[PDB]
Symmetry: C2
Subunit: 431 residues, 2 copies
């Protein structure tokens, strides 16, 4: 693959090439991408959507913002080293190290934009509705891939639809640069086959059947390498996708842990115990000992640990840069960390004390009821749009092919805020 | 001199920071942005109301949008400044994105010190010390100390949040001095009160508790001294005009947009008030094809903001030497050719949003919530010996002057999210 092509500035529907050298420095396509996400309705909605815990706890927006900041740093540092390794990219094509920061920052800002409320239980609730709920009836009317899109409904694939949703007067959705869409695509495959390997890029899927033709255009423009040997399509990751993934990995590992401590779910003593190897060479022990509040000590450790992992991930990427370019790299960047034992201890403690706390379990149980009810109401009205009641349901929840209609119902349920889903649920139940 | 106005100095520095010696991947101005993003005060803006009670903009998404608009203003102005004064780049090593970085960080922080409940929030705090319980401190405070309190200023509290030292954290967030300079749109103490009608004299920008800190900042930047008595003031850092412009553009157009999507302003007013602002750049076929009100008004908003950014850049360069000399007496937007349309927009927003029952009700309740919290804190300060007042201290604040204690009480009440302020209020009243 060619970095020249991986850094495409193309937007959907373009009829002429966009030369990097001719970009206006005050309107660089990669940086416009960031601003477009910031002002978009789907991004704004993340303000009222939950990450893990339903006092201050990170929302999807604040999480996405922090990932995009760590991502910009990764892309900036890697970009400087890529331009030193491949100097024609600058001298000939005019790329600059801040271009790489901008691409990673933008894709990182949007990486969770398609996620449904109630976190991962939300996805499972939607899939179960089509696996064994009312949605079962549609199986015989859908292709294997169309149905697999529903029973394994994936927030990452919905995020791609949100970024690229064509509408009357708004073709191409947000019309992000193709390099940014490539960096966003962690799982460059369709829903079938299911886990053809245990490579991270094969663990899930990245686009619905409704968006297959769009990602084909993206993958062709970027010159991504074909990976699947069959009629099921799969491509090797855009190299910058590894940096979006590492920014995400670093943030939820360390910041969930910090939230769990500040919330009282994790005892404080674990902060120094689990992060001491991650911070040992850079911590200022006199500064730490002078800090009086728990939250300031943990935030100091978090900042040191994120700094350590950013620097290491940049070094990992450069060490394996040619394997990533050739699609032969089989792991995440963080998988190769020398602190993998510390990262695993941190994650397993977060799982035990946060994800399995009674409050998270109660929200997940409630999310199953809410989402299932909304899906059944939308689907029963789809099947019998003529009755007076189903018309009211349509007015309240949604003011094409069967598959197109079902994937749209999932996308609309998924982008409801936590509060709108509860309200619509209560009204359908009468409260 | 622009070479001193672009200082990379941080609090406590013992040696000069030359721009030419900065690591491009760790540029001081860009690090400032990251430090704000991850700070507790910035995160707290998640749960703080801007105008309408809690889609609606919070302080967080407002600050985010202002920082994006400010980054564009600074990028465009930075490019023109470097062509006007080429030695800044050729000799000193400054680049046009430095100016974008300084404005973006200062704009991101511009409302970080604001209390809950809007500008009624500040007025409720001032009223507590003017006519409420806090009036008893008047004769134990200097004129400027008391004026700090009765005209409690969110901008001055922001400067406190950004810069104030605590054990283990000297210098607060330790932002670059150029960023602190661009943050300071009122470079004066609380007295004298409005010595002129210039926008820079309308309020004040630092408490007495932070006067020595801004003296260091102003000396390092070389700000022109505007007052010679023992009442100090300086001419604004030129980039403060761009922070102010980005803020003005955002709340003017975005509050209008919010008001239409909430139903408070009939949609027909959108095209009517914004036709001049968008007419030369609007694609009518696109506009007419958009089916949803929210899509039509967000398209007009994007176009109007783009128009005002371009014009503001031109206004800045036209008056650049007067701003550098401290003789510019107006805001950039005050010079806009669209002042008629801006005024109409603001007046309708005032009538339909600011004076709506929902906002009025919320501001009236905030007065009672903040007055109650302030009184509990001051009573506990006045008599720390009683059992009740010890419980209040455990609940709300778990050796300094009277003035420093009162300013900290104000800063801490201002730090509270809307929700945490209400809960603590309810407990005090037993609800
Ligand atoms: Mn994430
Ligand atoms: Mn503002």
């Amino acid at each position: 693959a060619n970095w020249e092509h991986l850094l495409s500035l193309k937007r959907q529907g373009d009829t002429a090439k966009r030369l990097r050298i001719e970009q206006d420095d005050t309107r660089l396509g990669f940086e416009v991408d960031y601003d477009r996400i910031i002002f978009s309705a789907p991004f704004r909605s993340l303000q009222d959507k939950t990450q893990v815990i339903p006092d201050f706890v990170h929302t999807r927006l604040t999480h996405s913002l922090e990932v995009s900041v760590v991502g910009r740093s990764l892309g900036r540092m890697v970009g400087k080293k890529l331009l030193e390794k491949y100097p024609h990219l600058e001298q000939v094509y005019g790329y600059k190290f801040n271009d790489f920061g901008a691409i990673v920052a933008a894709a990182a800002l949007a990486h969770d934009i398609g996620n449904p409320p109630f976190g991962h239980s939300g996805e499972k609730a939607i899939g179960e509705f089509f696996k064994n709920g009312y949605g079962k009836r549609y199986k015989d009317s859908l292709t294997a891939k169309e149905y697999q899109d529903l029973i394994k409904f994936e927030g990452n694939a919905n995020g791609f639809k949100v970024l690229s949703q064509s509408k009357p007067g708004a073709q191409g959705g947000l019309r992000l640069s193709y390099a940014t869409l490539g960096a966003f695509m962690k799982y460059p495959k369709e829903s079938l086959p299911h886990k053809p390997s245990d490579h991270i890029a094969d663990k899930k899927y990245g686009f619905f059947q409704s968006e297959r033709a769009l990602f084909e255009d993206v993958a062709q423009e970027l010159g991504l390498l074909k990976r699947s040997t069959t009629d099921d399509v799969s491509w090797s990751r855009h190299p910058l996708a590894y940096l979006v993934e590492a920014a995400d990995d670093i943030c939820y590992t360390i910041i969930d842990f910090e939230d769990g401590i500040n919330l009282g779910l994790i005892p404080e003593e674990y902060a120094l115990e689990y992060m001491v190897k991650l911070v040992g060479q850079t911590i200022d022990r006199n500064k730490y000992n002078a800090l009086q509040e728990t939250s300031d000590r943990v935030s100091y450790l978090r900042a040191l640990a994120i700094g350590t992992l950013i620097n290491e991930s940049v070094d990992t990427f450069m060490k394996y840069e040619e394997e990533i370019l050739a699609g032969t790299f089989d792991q995440s960047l963080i998988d190769k960390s020398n602190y993998q034992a510390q990262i695993t201890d941190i994650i397993n403690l977060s799982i035990e004390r946060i994800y399995n706390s009674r409050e998270v379990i109660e929200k997940e149980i409630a999310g199953y009821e809410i989402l299932s009810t909304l899906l059944e109401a939308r689907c029963r009205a789809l099947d019998n749009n003529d009755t007076h009641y189903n018309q009211l349901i349509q007015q309240l929840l949604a003011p094409k092919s069967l598959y197109e209609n079902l994937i749209q119902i999932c996308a609309e349920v998924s982008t409801m805020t936590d509060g709108k889903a509860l309200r619509n649920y209560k009204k359908i139940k009468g409260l």
